[PDB]
Point group: C3
Chain length 311, copies 3
């Protein structure tokens, strides 16, 4: 009758609501601690006087190794910068006489305070004098060898530690079920080697949907997410992380890039100088998330009440 028909629907409806979509499991949070170490040397040299060597202490800009590192792939350097009077970059002034520019800092993009003098910048152009980091103004042009292109083969290591807030279950990225592979020499693969934490930069960039040849010329942002999905309805094992290299690029306005400017201030015979670097590098962002969940009497009671209650 009506009662018999409603009884069958109740179990089937509650089966998907509570017997399938958890509810009998107490979901908890997580506390993560990810430390990243790189392994690579980029000796590409320059078309000038002598080669150059870039070790891990040079291209990984957060030295302490934050979860968001800015590993360098290209740069342009203006060496021996000192505060003085010289010719302004033509981006601001193209004067032909002393009346072209007025003394004082410009109301718009300026490189320093002007004393006021239309001096020679060479390059068959004339500009007005300024005071600032002015042995020569920085000239911006992205090189096209992709200077630190050897970073494509650079190696990451994203060992992560999970502790959970109250379940007192400690798990980490290095499962070590095979004892560090017993010969090391593993590279991560979304199909072949999904448990190897030694992702390569080229693979990381490629699996994000971007092109490294474009990300080694200008900058780029790559997101890596580690997701923990502990169930604790089984042995303490079988809980492993899942890495997703996100992209963030999609379509957008092509590839905007990512560059930042940093300086190396040094000192000489009485005066202070500066090595100005315009750095184009790929920024890797690491975000760890977890779900967890363990059996408890209270969630089961709440489900057995609401399940009957929903009737």
């Amino acid at each position: 009758i009506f009662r018999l028909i409603q009884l069958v629907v109740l179990v089937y409806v509650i089966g998907w609501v509570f017997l399938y979509e958890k509810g009998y499991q107490t979901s908890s949070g997580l506390i993560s601690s990810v430390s990243v170490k790189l392994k690579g040397l980029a000796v590409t040299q320059l078309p000038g006087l002598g080669p150059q060597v870039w070790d891990v202490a040079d291209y990984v800009f957060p030295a302490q190794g934050d979860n968001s590192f800015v590993v360098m792939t290209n740069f342009i350097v203006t060496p021996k910068q000192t505060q003085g009077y010289c010719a302004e970059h033509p981006e601001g002034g193209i004067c032909k006489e002393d009346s072209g520019c007025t003394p004082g800092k410009a109301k718009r993009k300026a490189q320093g305070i002007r004393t006021g003098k239309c001096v020679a910048f060479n390059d068959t152009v004339k500009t007005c004098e300024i005071f600032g980091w002015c042995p020569v103004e920085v000239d911006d042009d992205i090189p096209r060898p992709a200077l630190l292109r050897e970073a494509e083969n650079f190696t990451l290591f994203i060992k992560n530690s999970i502790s959970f807030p109250r379940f007192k279950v400690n798990r980490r990225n290095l499962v070590e079920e095979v004892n560090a592979a017993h010969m090391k020499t593993c590279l991560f693969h979304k199909t072949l080697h999904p448990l190897c934490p030694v992702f390569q930069l080229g693979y990381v960039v490629q699996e994000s949907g971007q092109n490294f040849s474009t990300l080694a010329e200008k900058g780029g942002v790559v997101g890596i997410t580690i997701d923990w999905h502990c169930d604790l309805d089984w042995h303490v094992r079988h809980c492993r992380p899942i890495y997703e290299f996100h992209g963030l690029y999609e379509e957008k306005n092509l590839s905007p890039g990512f560059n930042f400017r940093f300086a190396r201030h040094f000192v000489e015979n009485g005066t202070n100088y500066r090595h100005l670097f315009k750095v184009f590098g790929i920024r890797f962002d690491i975000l760890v998330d977890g779900k967890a969940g363990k059996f408890d009497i209270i969630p089961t009671m709440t489900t057995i009440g609401s399940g009957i209650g929903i009737f």
Copy 2:
């Protein structure tokens, strides 16, 4: 009782159903924030030549993470080397050179002590230490702030987000206009809410803090970007909301934000350093939002919950 309970039950269940969006499955987000600052601060000190500070100098760190510090004032102690010199007067004052507990002091540590004390000629006489000499004297904070031009500096926040389990990603920098109009906008809480370029003076002011007192001693300003949108409507309606918080309601005056960093250099084989006491404004940018799309399972759960509540009304009415 059936007529009265049915009218009431439908109303209360509908309130839980419609207003609370019980049929909607919310989801998290993953975001990346990149900040670009433009502006030059000229702090020509009286009695000497000018000194400019470009973005490579007053931004800590240079990479510009979510929590970055913009220098607004500083005290510099140049040419510091490890050697024998007198203590700062706030460590103790000699009357005779009968030691000052040679070795590291138990309370005020600035270098190991030698037991013989010389004249620190601020009318006082401290005791010799081995450490970074000369000793920093940061009693007088430069007032007004040296980098007063930081008020007009513009902060450009470029936040790009993506909603997991929905395959939708959006950027706070809205793609609706081109240059000469997107490169002219300045943010305003009412006039230009969608403009992503913020001015430091406006950001500090909108947090309830005075920039004049927040530049000399520093401060902490929090910027929150909130992505509160639903996927039921068109994705063009998903827009960010910017709110600036004066963290800890700036107490009453607050000590401000300050830190010490050094520039180490070598002169004739000797290691020196430039000690800086940086008074800057720390900006914290945290992005969080919730979004969802209609699905069959949340609707079924809401229907089951509402139908059960109607049955509870009949049971209560039966009493």
Copy 3:
């Protein structure tokens, strides 16, 4: 029979609903928070090395993030390779030992990335043959951890933590520094899990100690120590009862965390128009600070939902009564 069954069902309904309400605390509308924590370190570490001159380390030296972050390094040991010239040197024997002339031509080798070779071989130690590479060339980094930590005096350093939080949903904000601001006892406290539970956590040695990590082992080569701040206060009570709870974690199980934390760090300088470098192998203790909590408020909509949430006991109380 029916009346008694209905009375029993009502009694058990009331009992379970009351127990759930006293347990679930669902009538409170919990919300997130906005966190802001700033750390101040106070301590001087003096180092003694073979020579006539000691060395001191200011806070601007062993705190590597400098400007301060949630995660920071408080380095307690280091190895320094000074005056790196970036020229032609002898590669480290770890990369490879040559014989006669096995330079194998430049090309940065296959597994030993130490500059680019040159096809010539000359060395420094009793292994007098190790190939000639082009790179930072005072000497290759011969790193051995000093058994007594150089900055072992960091166990007495102070870690003044100033946490500012806010609840935007209910427009309430609190600070790590508890009520009765300033007044007496100026800078005369020290955090203890039982004796002094309300004062910013200090004494790095004690912070490492309250994680089962044996700072003496952590000073030489140790690594990450986690600090968690949980507020967990209900705003229905007085707002002065909302206080932080500090918990220190280890995030370790003694499997591969024994090497701890280390990172390279370089100081570049110029002498006679030549770029040089001071390479540091820095062994430090990383401190991570994580803050979270839920406030909750009485309101009316959560009360209505909990009344609806209480329909679980009242849903099939009569429906299941006739079944049995």
